Coordinates of C-alpha atoms and ligand atoms in Angstrom, one line a residue:
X21 CA 14.9 -18.3 -15.2
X22 CA 13.6 -16.2 -18.0
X23 CA 14.3 -13.1 -15.7
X24 CA 17.0 -13.1 -13.1
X25 CA 15.5 -10.0 -11.3
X26 CA 12.0 -8.6 -11.1
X27 CA 11.4 -5.1 -10.0
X28 CA 7.7 -4.6 -8.9
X29 CA 6.6 -1.1 -8.2
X30 CA 3.2 -0.4 -6.5
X31 CA 2.2 3.2 -7.1
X32 CA 0.0 3.1 -4.0
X33 CA -3.7 4.0 -4.8
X34 CA -3.0 5.1 -8.4
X35 CA -6.3 3.9 -9.9
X36 CA -7.3 4.0 -13.6
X37 CA -11.1 4.2 -13.3
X38 CA -14.2 2.7 -11.6
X39 CA -14.3 -1.1 -11.4
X40 CA -17.3 -3.1 -12.5
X41 CA -18.3 -3.5 -8.8
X42 CA -17.8 0.1 -7.8
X43 CA -21.5 0.6 -7.1
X44 CA -21.4 -1.7 -4.1
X45 CA -18.8 0.5 -2.5
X46 CA -20.4 3.9 -3.3
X47 CA -17.5 4.4 -5.8
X48 CA -19.5 5.2 -9.0
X49 CA -17.8 7.9 -10.9
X50 CA -14.3 7.3 -9.5
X51 CA -11.2 7.8 -11.6
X52 CA -7.9 8.6 -9.8
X53 CA -5.6 9.2 -12.7
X54 CA -8.4 10.7 -14.9
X55 CA -9.6 13.3 -12.4
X56 CA -6.0 14.3 -11.5
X57 CA -5.2 14.7 -15.2
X58 CA -8.2 17.1 -15.6
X59 CA -7.3 19.1 -12.6
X60 CA -3.7 19.5 -13.8
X61 CA -5.0 20.5 -17.3
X62 CA -2.9 17.7 -18.7
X63 CA -0.6 15.4 -16.6
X64 CA 3.0 15.4 -17.7
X65 CA 4.0 11.8 -17.5
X66 CA 6.1 11.2 -20.7
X67 CA 7.9 8.1 -19.4
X68 CA 4.8 6.3 -18.3
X69 CA 3.4 7.3 -21.7
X70 CA 6.4 5.7 -23.4
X71 CA 5.7 2.5 -21.5
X72 CA 2.1 2.4 -22.7
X73 CA 0.0 4.1 -20.0
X74 CA -2.2 5.9 -22.5
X75 CA -2.5 2.7 -24.5
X76 CA -4.3 1.3 -21.4
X77 CA -6.5 4.4 -21.3
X78 CA -6.1 7.9 -22.8
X79 CA -6.5 10.7 -20.3
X80 CA -5.8 14.4 -20.4
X81 CA -2.0 14.8 -21.3
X82 CA -1.6 11.0 -21.5
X83 CA -1.9 9.7 -25.1
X84 CA -1.3 6.3 -26.7
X85 CA 1.9 5.6 -28.5
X86 CA 2.4 3.4 -31.6
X87 CA 5.3 1.4 -30.2
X88 CA 5.0 1.1 -26.4
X89 CA 8.3 0.1 -24.7
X90 CA 6.6 -2.8 -22.9
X91 CA 3.3 -4.7 -22.4
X92 CA 0.3 -3.1 -20.9
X93 CA -3.2 -3.8 -19.6
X94 CA -5.2 -3.2 -16.4
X95 CA -6.2 -5.5 -13.5
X96 CA -9.4 -6.1 -11.7
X97 CA -9.6 -6.9 -8.0
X98 CA -11.4 -10.1 -7.0
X99 CA -11.1 -9.7 -3.2
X100 CA -13.9 -8.2 -1.3
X101 CA -12.2 -5.1 0.2
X102 CA -10.4 -2.1 -1.4
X103 CA -7.8 -1.5 1.4
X104 CA -4.0 -1.7 1.1
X105 CA -3.6 -5.1 2.8
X106 CA -6.2 -6.7 0.6
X107 CA -4.7 -5.3 -2.6
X108 CA -1.1 -6.3 -1.8
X109 CA -2.1 -9.7 -0.5
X110 CA -4.0 -10.4 -3.7
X111 CA -1.0 -9.2 -5.8
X112 CA 1.2 -11.8 -4.1
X113 CA -1.2 -14.7 -4.8
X114 CA -4.0 -14.7 -2.2
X115 CA -7.9 -14.1 -2.2
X116 CA -9.3 -12.2 0.8
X117 CA -13.0 -12.6 1.5
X118 CA -13.0 -10.5 4.6
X119 CA -12.4 -6.8 4.2
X120 CA -10.4 -4.5 6.6
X121 CA -12.7 -1.8 8.0
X122 CA -12.2 2.0 8.4
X123 CA -13.8 4.1 11.2
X124 CA -14.5 7.7 10.2
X125 CA -17.0 8.2 13.0
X126 CA -14.9 6.4 15.5
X127 CA -14.8 2.8 16.7
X128 CA -17.9 1.0 17.8
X129 CA -18.8 1.2 21.6
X130 CA -18.8 -2.6 21.9
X131 CA -15.2 -2.8 20.9
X132 CA -14.1 0.1 23.2
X133 CA -16.1 -1.4 26.1
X134 CA -14.3 -4.8 25.7
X135 CA -10.9 -3.0 25.6
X136 CA -11.8 -1.2 28.9
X137 CA -13.0 -4.4 30.4
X138 CA -9.8 -6.2 29.6
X139 CA -7.4 -3.4 30.5
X140 CA -8.8 -1.6 33.5
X141 CA -8.4 1.7 31.7
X142 CA -10.8 4.3 30.4
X143 CA -10.7 5.3 26.8
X144 CA -10.9 8.9 25.5
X145 CA -11.1 10.5 22.1
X146 CA -12.4 7.9 19.7
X147 CA -12.2 9.8 16.3
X148 CA -9.9 10.1 13.2
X149 CA -7.3 12.7 14.0
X150 CA -3.5 13.5 13.3
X151 CA -1.1 12.7 16.1
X152 CA -0.6 16.4 16.7
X153 CA -4.3 17.6 16.9
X154 CA -5.3 14.8 19.2
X155 CA -2.4 15.3 21.7
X156 CA -3.1 19.1 21.7
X157 CA -6.7 18.3 22.5
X158 CA -6.4 15.4 25.0
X159 CA -2.8 15.0 26.1
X160 CA -3.4 16.9 29.3
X161 CA -6.5 14.9 30.3
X162 CA -4.5 11.7 29.5
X163 CA -1.7 12.7 31.9
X164 CA -4.1 13.6 34.7
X165 CA -6.4 10.5 34.5
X166 CA -4.2 7.6 33.2
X167 CA -6.8 7.2 30.4
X168 CA -5.9 5.9 26.9
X169 CA -6.2 8.1 23.9
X170 CA -7.7 6.0 21.1
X171 CA -7.7 7.5 17.6
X172 CA -8.0 6.6 14.0
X173 CA -7.0 7.7 10.5
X174 CA -8.6 7.5 7.1
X175 CA -6.9 4.1 6.8
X176 CA -7.6 0.8 8.7
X177 CA -5.8 1.7 11.9
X178 CA -6.4 1.8 15.6
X179 CA -3.8 4.1 17.4
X180 CA -3.4 4.2 21.2
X181 CA -1.6 7.1 22.7
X182 CA -0.2 7.5 26.2
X183 CA 2.5 9.6 27.9
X184 CA 5.6 7.6 28.7
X185 CA 5.8 9.0 32.2
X186 CA 2.2 8.1 33.0
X187 CA 1.7 4.8 31.2
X188 CA 4.9 2.7 31.2
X189 CA 5.9 1.7 27.6
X190 CA 5.6 -2.1 28.5
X191 CA 2.1 -1.6 29.7
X192 CA 1.1 0.3 26.5
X193 CA 2.6 -2.5 24.4
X194 CA 0.5 -5.0 26.5
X195 CA -2.6 -2.9 25.9
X196 CA -1.9 -2.8 22.1
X197 CA -1.6 -6.6 22.0
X198 CA -5.0 -7.0 23.8
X199 CA -6.5 -4.5 21.2
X200 CA -4.8 -6.5 18.4
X201 CA -6.7 -9.7 19.6
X202 CA -10.0 -7.9 19.9
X203 CA -9.8 -6.5 16.5
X204 CA -9.4 -10.0 14.8
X205 CA -13.1 -9.8 14.5
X206 CA -14.9 -9.1 11.3
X207 CA -17.2 -6.6 12.9
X208 CA -14.1 -4.5 13.8
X209 CA -11.3 -5.7 11.5
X210 CA -8.4 -3.3 11.6
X211 CA -5.3 -3.7 9.6
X212 CA -2.9 -2.3 12.1
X213 CA -2.9 -1.5 15.8
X214 CA -0.2 1.2 16.6
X215 CA 1.3 2.2 20.0
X216 CA 1.8 6.0 20.0
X217 CA 3.8 6.9 23.1
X218 CA 4.5 10.6 23.7
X219 CA 6.3 12.9 26.1
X220 CA 6.3 16.6 27.1
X221 CA 3.8 19.0 28.6
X222 CA 0.6 20.6 27.5
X223 CA 1.4 22.9 24.6
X224 CA 4.6 20.9 23.8
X225 CA 3.8 17.1 23.3
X226 CA 6.0 15.1 21.0
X227 CA 5.4 11.5 19.8
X228 CA 8.5 9.4 20.5
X229 CA 10.4 6.8 18.4
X230 CA 9.1 4.1 20.7
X231 CA 6.1 3.5 18.4
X232 CA 5.4 -0.2 18.0
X233 CA 3.0 -1.8 15.4
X234 CA 0.8 -4.9 15.6
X235 CA -0.1 -6.1 12.1
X236 CA -1.9 -9.3 10.9
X237 CA -0.1 -11.9 8.7
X238 CA -1.4 -12.4 5.3
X239 CA -4.3 -15.0 5.2
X240 CA -2.2 -17.5 3.4
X241 CA 1.4 -18.3 2.4
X242 CA 2.3 -15.8 -0.4
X243 CA 4.6 -15.9 -3.4
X244 CA 7.1 -14.0 -1.3
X245 CA 7.1 -16.9 1.2
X246 CA 7.8 -19.3 -1.6
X247 CA 10.6 -17.2 -3.0
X248 CA 12.3 -16.9 0.4
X249 CA 11.9 -20.6 1.1
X250 CA 13.6 -21.4 -2.3
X251 CA 16.6 -19.2 -1.4
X252 CA 15.7 -16.3 -3.6
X253 CA 16.2 -12.7 -2.5
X254 CA 13.0 -10.7 -1.6
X255 CA 14.0 -7.1 -1.1
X256 CA 11.1 -5.0 0.4
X257 CA 11.3 -1.2 0.0
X258 CA 9.1 1.2 1.9
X259 CA 5.9 0.0 3.6
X260 CA 6.1 -3.5 1.8
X261 CA 7.6 -5.3 4.8
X262 CA 4.9 -3.8 7.2
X263 CA 2.2 -4.7 4.7
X264 CA 3.1 -8.4 4.6
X265 CA 4.2 -8.4 8.3
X266 CA 7.6 -9.5 7.1
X267 CA 6.4 -12.6 5.6
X268 CA 8.8 -13.8 2.9
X269 CA 11.1 -10.7 3.2
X270 CA 14.9 -11.3 3.1
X271 CA 15.9 -7.6 3.3
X272 CA 13.9 -4.4 4.1
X273 CA 14.8 -0.8 3.2
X274 CA 12.9 2.0 5.0
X275 CA 12.0 5.0 3.0
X276 CA 10.9 8.5 4.0
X277 CA 9.2 9.8 0.8
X278 CA 8.5 8.7 -2.9
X279 CA 11.8 10.2 -4.1
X280 CA 13.6 8.2 -1.4
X281 CA 11.8 5.1 -2.6
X282 CA 13.0 5.7 -6.1
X283 CA 16.5 6.1 -4.7
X284 CA 16.2 2.7 -2.9
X285 CA 14.9 1.2 -6.1
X286 CA 18.1 2.5 -7.8
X287 CA 20.2 1.0 -4.9
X288 CA 18.6 -2.4 -5.7
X289 CA 19.3 -2.1 -9.4
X290 CA 23.0 -1.8 -8.3
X291 CA 22.8 -5.0 -6.2
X292 CA 23.7 -8.5 -7.4
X293 CA 20.6 -10.4 -6.3
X294 CA 18.4 -13.1 -7.9
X295 CA 14.7 -12.6 -7.0
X296 CA 12.3 -9.8 -6.3
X297 CA 12.8 -6.2 -5.5
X298 CA 9.3 -4.8 -4.4
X299 CA 8.7 -1.1 -3.9
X300 CA 5.6 0.7 -2.5
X301 CA 5.4 4.4 -3.3
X302 CA 3.0 5.5 -0.4
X303 CA 2.8 9.3 -0.7
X304 CA 0.2 9.2 -3.3
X305 CA -2.3 7.5 -0.9
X306 CA -1.1 9.0 2.5
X307 CA -0.5 12.6 1.5
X308 CA -2.8 13.3 -1.4
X309 CA -5.5 10.8 -1.9
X310 CA -6.9 10.6 1.6
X311 CA -6.5 14.4 1.9
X312 CA -8.4 14.9 -1.3
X313 CA -5.6 17.1 -2.8
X314 CA -5.5 16.6 -6.6
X315 CA -2.8 19.3 -7.1
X316 CA -0.4 17.6 -4.7
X317 CA -1.2 14.2 -6.2
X318 CA -0.6 15.6 -9.7
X319 CA 2.8 17.1 -8.7
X320 CA 3.8 13.8 -7.1
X321 CA 3.0 11.8 -10.2
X322 CA 5.1 14.2 -12.3
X323 CA 8.0 13.9 -9.9
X324 CA 7.8 10.1 -10.0
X325 CA 7.6 10.0 -13.8
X326 CA 10.8 12.2 -14.0
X327 CA 12.8 9.5 -12.1
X328 CA 12.0 6.7 -14.6
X329 CA 14.6 7.2 -17.3
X330 CA 17.4 6.3 -14.8
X331 CA 15.5 3.1 -14.0
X332 CA 15.3 2.3 -17.8
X333 CA 19.0 3.0 -18.1
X334 CA 20.0 0.5 -15.4
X335 CA 17.7 -2.4 -16.3
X336 CA 19.5 -5.4 -17.7
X337 CA 18.4 -7.7 -20.5
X338 CA 17.4 -10.3 -18.0
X339 CA 15.5 -7.9 -15.7
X340 CA 11.8 -7.2 -15.7
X341 CA 10.1 -4.1 -14.4
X342 CA 6.4 -4.3 -13.3
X343 CA 4.4 -1.2 -12.5
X344 CA 1.0 -1.3 -10.9
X345 CA -1.3 -0.1 -8.1
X346 CA -3.3 -1.7 -5.2
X347 CA -6.7 0.2 -5.4
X348 CA -7.7 3.7 -6.3
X349 CA -8.0 6.8 -4.0
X350 CA -9.5 9.5 -6.2
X351 CA -8.7 12.9 -4.7
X352 CA -12.0 14.4 -6.1
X353 CA -14.4 11.9 -4.6
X354 CA -16.6 12.3 -1.5
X355 CA -15.4 11.2 2.0
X356 CA -11.9 10.0 2.9
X357 CA -11.8 6.4 1.8
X358 CA -10.2 4.5 -1.0
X359 CA -12.0 4.0 -4.3
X360 CA -12.8 0.6 -6.0
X361 CA -10.9 0.9 -9.4
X362 CA -9.1 -1.0 -11.9
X363 CA -5.3 -0.6 -11.7
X364 CA -2.7 -0.2 -14.5
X365 CA -0.3 -2.8 -15.3
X366 CA 2.9 -2.1 -17.3
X367 CA 5.6 -4.8 -17.9
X368 CA 8.9 -3.8 -19.4
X369 CA 12.3 -5.4 -20.1
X370 CA 15.0 -4.0 -22.4
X371 CA 15.1 -7.5 -24.0
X372 CA 11.7 -6.5 -25.5
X373 CA 13.4 -5.4 -28.7
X374 CA 10.2 -4.8 -30.7
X375 CA 8.3 -3.1 -27.9
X376 CA 5.2 -4.6 -26.3
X377 CA 1.5 -5.3 -27.0
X378 CA -1.7 -5.3 -25.2
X379 CA -2.3 -8.1 -22.6
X380 CA -5.7 -9.6 -21.9
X381 CA -7.2 -7.8 -18.8
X382 CA -6.0 -9.5 -15.6
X383 CA -9.0 -10.8 -13.8
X384 CA -7.3 -10.8 -10.4
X385 CA -4.3 -8.9 -9.1
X386 CA -2.8 -12.4 -8.3
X387 CA -1.8 -12.6 -11.9
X388 CA 1.3 -10.7 -10.9
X389 CA 2.2 -13.3 -8.2
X390 CA 1.5 -16.1 -10.6
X391 CA 3.9 -14.5 -13.1
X392 CA 6.6 -14.1 -10.5
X393 CA 6.2 -17.6 -9.2
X394 CA 6.4 -19.1 -12.7
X395 CA 9.5 -17.1 -13.5
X396 CA 11.4 -18.4 -10.5
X397 CA 10.1 -22.0 -10.7
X398 CA 8.5 -21.9 -7.2
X399 CA 5.1 -23.3 -6.2
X400 CA 2.3 -21.6 -8.1
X401 CA -0.3 -19.6 -6.1
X402 CA -3.8 -21.0 -5.7
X403 CA -5.2 -17.9 -7.5
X404 CA -3.9 -16.1 -10.6
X405 CA -2.8 -16.7 -14.1
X406 CA 0.7 -15.9 -15.2
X407 CA 1.3 -13.7 -18.3
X408 CA 5.1 -14.7 -18.3
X409 CA 4.9 -16.5 -21.7
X410 CA 2.9 -13.5 -23.2
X411 CA 6.0 -11.2 -22.7
Ligands
MN525 MN1 -16.7 6.2 -2.5
MN526 MN1 -2.7 1.2 -0.8
MN527 MN1 -5.0 4.5 2.3

């Protein structure tokens, strides 16, 4: 292998400007990094700048450098949707025609009607809400009627809440499995069904750790599958295992925040493995993008960039670091949905003794998967063009 270890970091939702098909998605004008940089009166990201971020695209506080540490370009998404599953699936070698849907006004009546009809239970709520607001609002009614509280988020989720002393857990998991079948339907395609059991009394409801998720497998065997089947390590950090429903994962490390994700990245640098270490930094999407909070997003980007020198210090001559994103989520854009954007790509190894150069624009995210597969000598994905020999 040219590289013994590859460290792939998805900065979740960190877009670098409107894609050529943004108009189809109502995403004209979008620019996640750009708008944040203007809000911050200059983003302070000196380490991403040293890698070549401003060589991809100059933005406020983010300038090009003469000798970038590694190679740089951007990537265009080929898949139909702009959700997290689509983007990640494409990164690992797939093409996804059928988008996952989001439900800001609630789920369609036809779906909720069929869930009632299969379960024998009435549904209440049916809107985007936090766990806390929805339980305050409807927890008491739920307790008194046996009804199911159905809510959503700004992401592709269907969440079903019920009190553990009113709806037994096993019954709630059965209900979520029925909902998971009903939502494999392109009219209603949700990424994840989540059981949200709770306990307590009105005024004091708490969600319990008995949460269970019902995800879809990727629509194809990914590069991760091929790695795992060839006895490589595939270390998933953060939401990566959930995103691929475990497919192809040999070890999974839960994280609680972006700093904790960078700590687990560092833990993997200290491991003797051969294969892929794959990190998702989700806070950018979950806390700041969907909440349309440019200040919080800005601070988080700065906090991330400050962790990078330690990663540079630990990379070996036969390691490769890849940094990208899975879509945009511009915190100064209408609504609460993602944005259809190009994503940055940075590729760095300390064996790059002269620094890097510009790569041709990657016409699918699957170029990353193709690179990884070529590096490790495993079956090449159906989609994607490796840039391994360009490095
Ligand atoms: Mn939009
Ligand atoms: Mn995402
Ligand atoms: Mn999201």
